[PDB]
Structures are given as C-alpha cells and as structure tokens.
C-alpha cells in the first residue's frame, strides 16, 4: 500500500492547499480591513490627543491587546468563569477533546494538573463513549425494528429494509442531536440558525474552536443549562462517531 | 455491561466534579488578573497623558478590542490568512485540534468550514490509520532487532516484547515530546512547562489555543514554521498508541 499512502498523503496536502486557498479568499479581506480600522483608530486618536506619540499609543494598544487576550472585558472597569458549573464544564471540554479554550489556565499548577487530568481523562471518556455507542446502536435498531417490521408487513424486501433502516437511523439522529439543538441554541444563545449549526458541528466533530460556546454568556442565570448540554454532547458524539466512520467508508468505496 | 456502563458513567461524573473542584481551587483566585492588568494600563495612561479623559480612553479600548476581534494585529505580513497560516488553519480542522487562536468572521467561511471538516476529518482519519500502521510495521521491524539483543541476554521473549513496546513508546516520546518541548522553549520563548502543556494539549487534539507555534514563516528558520505540522502528524500517530495503551490499562482494571 506504500504507493497508495503517498497518493493519499498528497491528496490530503492538495485538500489542505485547496482549503487554504478558499479560507484565505473568504477570510483574508476582512482581516486586512480590521488591520486598516485599527490604523484608522490610531490616526484619529493622535489627531485628538497631541500629548500622545505614535509609539506610546503603540505600547497602549499592545498592552491592551495582551489584557484582552487574557480575557479582560473592554465594557467594564470593576476589580465567575471558574464557578463549580463552568469548572465542571471546562473539565468536560478536556476529556471530550473538544477544548473550546474560551477560558484559559493562568497558573503553572493549573497547566501541570491539566496534562495528567487529560492523559487519564480522554481514554476514560473514550471507553464510556464506545459503551454509550454500543448501547445507542442496540436501542435504536431494536426500536427501528418495529417501524422496520411495518415496512416488512407491507411485503417490502428484507435487504431493502436494512438500508431503509440505515437511512432512517441517520434521520432519527439528526433530528435529535443536529436540528433540535441548533433550534434550541438559536432561541437560548440568540445566535443565527447558521451560527448554531456551525457551533453544533464544530462541537460534535470535537474541533471546538471556542468562538461559539453554549452557556458561556455571563448574563444568563441558567447554570443547570450548561451541564445539561454536556449530556447532549455525550449522546451527540456517539451519533457523530458513527457518521464520521461511515463517511470514511464512503471515501473507501470511492477509493 | 449494564452495571459496567452506569458504574463507568458515575466514575466519569465524579472525575469531572473532582476535576471541577481542583480547577476552581487553582484558577478562581486569579480570575480578575487580566481585568486588573487592563485597569493598571488605563490608569497609568491617564496619568502619563492629561489631554485624555477616562471616557475617551474607554472608547479607544472598545474600538481597539473590535479591531483585534476582526483579526487586526498590534503592529510595532503578520497575516493570519496568508497561504501559510490558512493552510495551518485548515490543518487544525481535519486534525480535530481546532486551536481557534484565529476565528472565522464570514458566514461563508463558517458554512465552507462545516463541509470542509465533515469531509476532511474522516479523510485525515483514514490517512492517520494508514500513517500509524506504515510507521508501526517499520518501527516493529526495528523492534525485532532490539528484541534480538534482549533475546541474546536470555530475557524471556514475552518480557522482551513488553520491554521493546515500552522502549517503543519511550523512543517515540523522546523523538516527538522532548525534542519539540526543547525546540519550542528556544523558538517560542516559552518555559519547558508551557512547551509540554502545548505539546500534550496539541497531540491529545484538545487544542485550547492559549499556546500555538502558528506555522507562520517569519524569518531565521521559516522552513520549520509549517514543518511542525509534520511533528503534529507523526506525533499524533505515537500519541494515538499512548492514548490506547492508557485506555486499555483502565479496561484491564
């Protein structure tokens, strides 16, 4: 297979390069405009404030940037991200390998503990997921059988019914773990339908950018909400595990 | 299994709750540090520049925050969506690492990202299994020759196998964990602790994004910048085995 792997490797590289071109094309113009806007803000501030040098305003912006980067809020001047609810949720983002990162560890102790927490945590959760997966399969297939049998009752072929059940399985999951949550989050997080789908998928793929995080919003008095989502994650991931393995098979069939 | 899964579930929940307690204990004390630093910077600036009202400095910080939010960079290149950085970003997707140190701003960008990942992750998954086996068999070929030396000192061969496999996951570790931590220490101006934290957060595919090499060709060693994706690919393979061996151990007990 060594020839095939070189072919596969180059295929992935081409895929990344094509991804890179598309992402640049779509994202770079806005990033260049943001840069121009920072520059416009500096030039207006110098014109307004003659006792400030270009270079002193430069340090202010760098120092401000570092503080915002540490999670400082521009809106306030006062003085919990690590309340038991959010801290539980943060631990959840580790073992799931989602790793939103919308709140960072500041302590060397925090980081050192995180290493061993993850090294023990991820494989542990991996085992549970396989378990929940097997359980999920049994549950749905036994359930799908009854409606599967109604198709069999109207005399349709058994080999046809397996694939109908397979397709039906995919539909059931999507409604329960893709569309419902997107609709849920749309209402709860005041996101757009597309923002919500983006979040849902980025979450269940375990990519976890952290640009979008359900519950994170400081204002919301719904701490019970955030872990409840973590149960959706638990159930969602097994569903998406199946989807991700199966789409690989589709690519295997194409190759 | 019924007992097993509910037992395992409760175990995981307890683990999460105990994790929560430990994190809150360590991290809640320092929550407001970045707010304190911003405030320090503001007040120090008002003292230095009497032509500036607290309210005018206020808008500057909001306007700067929005610019940075849009991907503007404090400048004193630097493009996160130049072909090099955009390649690396696409890499963060299919690997499921997802640093997010650079966010998508366009709804079109997000829409494409969905399909790019949904097709891209399994494709990489396939290649990873492939690259895992190819290296695995090649390493195993190497393992046999090491096993021979142990065999010729009359170590029982089952002991030799485990000894070799342990050496297996140790040479891999030195090759992919220690070298980078040293590399990053020098290259990124990180502490050896920050570097191992980065390496492991990376190879576990957690990808917080608090620490990122960046694969950004800057100068001095520009070749190495995208080259670390090579370490990631190779490293991920080694760490896959590490994760499974830790996982299998938990199953064993």
């Amino acid at each position, epitope marked *: 297979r060594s020839t095939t792997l070189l072919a596969l490797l180059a295929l992935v590289l081409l895929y990344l390069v094509s991804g890179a071109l598309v992402f640049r094309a779509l994202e770079q113009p806005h990033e260049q405009q943001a840069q121009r806007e920072l*520059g*416009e803000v500096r*030039e207006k501030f*110098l*014109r307004a404030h*003659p*006792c*400030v*040098s*270009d*270079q*002193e305003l*430069g340090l202010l912006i760098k120092e401000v940037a570092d503080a915002l980067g540490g999670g400082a809020d521009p809106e306030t001047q006062s003085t919990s991200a690590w309340d038991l609810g959010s801290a539980f949720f943060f631990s959840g983002t580790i073992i799931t390998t989602i790793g939103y990162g919308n709140v960072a560890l500041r302590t060397d102790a925090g980081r050192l503990f995180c290493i061993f927490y993850a090294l023990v945590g991820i494989p542990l959760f991996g085992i549970l997921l396989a378990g929940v997966g097997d359980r999920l399969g049994s549950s749905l297939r036994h359930g799908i059988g009854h409606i599967e049998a109604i198709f069999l009752k109207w005399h349709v072929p058994p080999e046809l019914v397996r694939v109908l059940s397979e397709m039906l399985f995919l539909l059931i999951g999507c409604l329960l773990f893709v569309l419902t949550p997107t609709f849920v989050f749309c209402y709860m997080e005041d996101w757009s339908k597309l923002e919500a789908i983006y979040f849902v998928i980025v979450t269940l793929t375990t990519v976890g950018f952290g640009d979008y995080v359900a519950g994170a919003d400081p204002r919301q008095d719904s701490p019970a909400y955030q872990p409840l989502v973590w149960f959706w994650i638990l159930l969602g991931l097994a569903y998406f595990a199946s989807v991700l393995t199966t789409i690989g098979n589709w690519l295997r069939v194409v190759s | 299994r019924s007992t097993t899964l509910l037992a395992l579930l409760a175990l995981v929940l307890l683990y999460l709750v105990s994790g929560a307690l430990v994190f809150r204990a360590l991290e809640q004390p320092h929550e407001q540090q970045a707010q304190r630093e911003l405030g320090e910077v503001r007040e120090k600036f008002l003292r*230095a*520049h*009497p*032509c500036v009202s607290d309210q005018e400095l206020g808008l500057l910080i909001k306007e700067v925050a929005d610019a940075l939010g849009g991907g503007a960079d404090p400048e*004193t290149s630097h493009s996160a969506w130049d072909l090099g950085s955009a390649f690396f970003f696409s890499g963060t997707i299919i690997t499921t690492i997802g640093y997010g140190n650079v966010a998508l701003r366009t709804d079109a960008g997000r829409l494409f990202c969905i399909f790019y990942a949904l097709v891209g992750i399994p494709l990489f998954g396939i290649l990873l299994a492939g690259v895992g086996d190819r290296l695995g068999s090649s390493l195993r070929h190497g393992i046999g020759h090491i096993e021979a030396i142990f065999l010729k000192w009359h170590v029982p061969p089952e002991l030799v196998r485990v000894l070799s496999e342990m050496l297996f996951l140790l040479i891999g570790c030195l090759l992919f964990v220690l070298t980078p931590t040293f590399v990053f220490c020098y290259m990124e101006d990180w502490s050896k602790l920050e570097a191992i934290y980065f390496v492991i957060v990376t190879l576990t595919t957690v990808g917080f994004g608090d620490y990122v090499a960046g694969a950004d060709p800057r100068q001095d060693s520009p070749a190495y910048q995208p080259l670390v994706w090579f370490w990631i690919l190779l490293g991920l393979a080694y760490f896959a085995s590490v994760l499974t061996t830790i996982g299998n151990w938990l199953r064993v007990v």
Partner: antibody
Amino acid sequence: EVQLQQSGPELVKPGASMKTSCKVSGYSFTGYIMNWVKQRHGKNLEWIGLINPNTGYTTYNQKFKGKATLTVDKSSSTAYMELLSLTSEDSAIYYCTRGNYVFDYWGQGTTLTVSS
Amino acid sequence: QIVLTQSPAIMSASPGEKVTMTCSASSSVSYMHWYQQKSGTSPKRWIYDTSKLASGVPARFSGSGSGTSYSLTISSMEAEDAATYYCQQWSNSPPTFGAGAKLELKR
C-alpha cells in the same frame, strides 16, 4: 504666536560630540511631541527621533539610534539634541519641530559643521 | 522605510500657469502633508491631512490624493510660490519625506 527658538551655529572637531537646544514659547511645551529633523544638501529631510516632553518617552529613527540623545528641561521648556562621535556626514542643518502626525511648527534651524 | 518619490525634482512655471507636483508612496498611506521651504528659512507646514491648508497658506493652493499617489496644486502660479515643496507621511513610523520639488519662476 507659537515659536521654537534654536541655539546658534556650532563647529566641532571630528570625534567630538555636540548638544543643541530649542526653547518653545506661546504654548505648553509638555502638551505636544517634539521632533528633530536633519537637512543635508544631497539627501531628503530626515526625521532623527521624537521625545514626549511630559513623559520623557523617546524613539529614534534606526539610522540615528547610536548617534543622537533627545532630552528636555520641563522648567525652562527647552528640548536638547546631543550628537556623538561626529563625522563630516553630520555636517547639516538640524531643526526642532512640533507634532505627533504633521510637523506644524519648526525652529529656524541650526547649522552643524564638523571640521578639523 | 515608506519611500516618497517627488519627480521631477525641479520644475518651472510662468506666472498664471496651473502647477501640480505629485508624491508617490512605496506603500499605501492614509494622509499626505506638504511643506514649503525658501532658501535661508526652515520648512513651513503648507498642507496637512492631504487637503487642509495651514493658517497663512493662500487659497490658490490645493492638495489631493489617496493610497500611494498624492498631489499639491497651484491654480495660478505667483512669484512668491517659487520654493521647494516636500511631502511627508506619518501613517507608518518612522515618518519620511520626499526629496522635495524645487519650483522656479519661468522668464
């Protein structure tokens, strides 16, 4: 009337250093950034560096990093430029000028001659 | 390290001629400023922020431009306009100047 009054022409030996001054009047010295500019007949007008007279903050053109030291006396509202280990390449007219984006007021200039 | 190019370096105008001198920037710049210098005297702020006239500057002077191309214009050349005109930029530190454009009277 905003005014920048520079000290007179200076003649110094190769290798010597030199210090020139600019007293401001008609405005608050500490309110505005102060700059020095070099005019040689052959070359472009060249920005040397700036000082914030209120904070003492300084930055230099990379081309003059080692050469030039800017300082101020807040009490006498006077800006100073020092030039070190002088060569004939430093023979020029030097101006102090005010501004943080545009140089809105200039001194009359001082002529430096480096010569044995 | 932004470079400003004034060409030609010297130019001549009969009284009543419309004159335009241009300043090319090696990369994009948000605002261009201009100084007038007559032999024996320091540069004077002439135009700032591309098209703003400094206090004493007579109305026959205009400035214009954007991006990497900027211009100073005299609607009708006068005797007292014979001088050297410099562009300068400060959209990027360090601020930089054109080599200047010397405008002589034609006779």
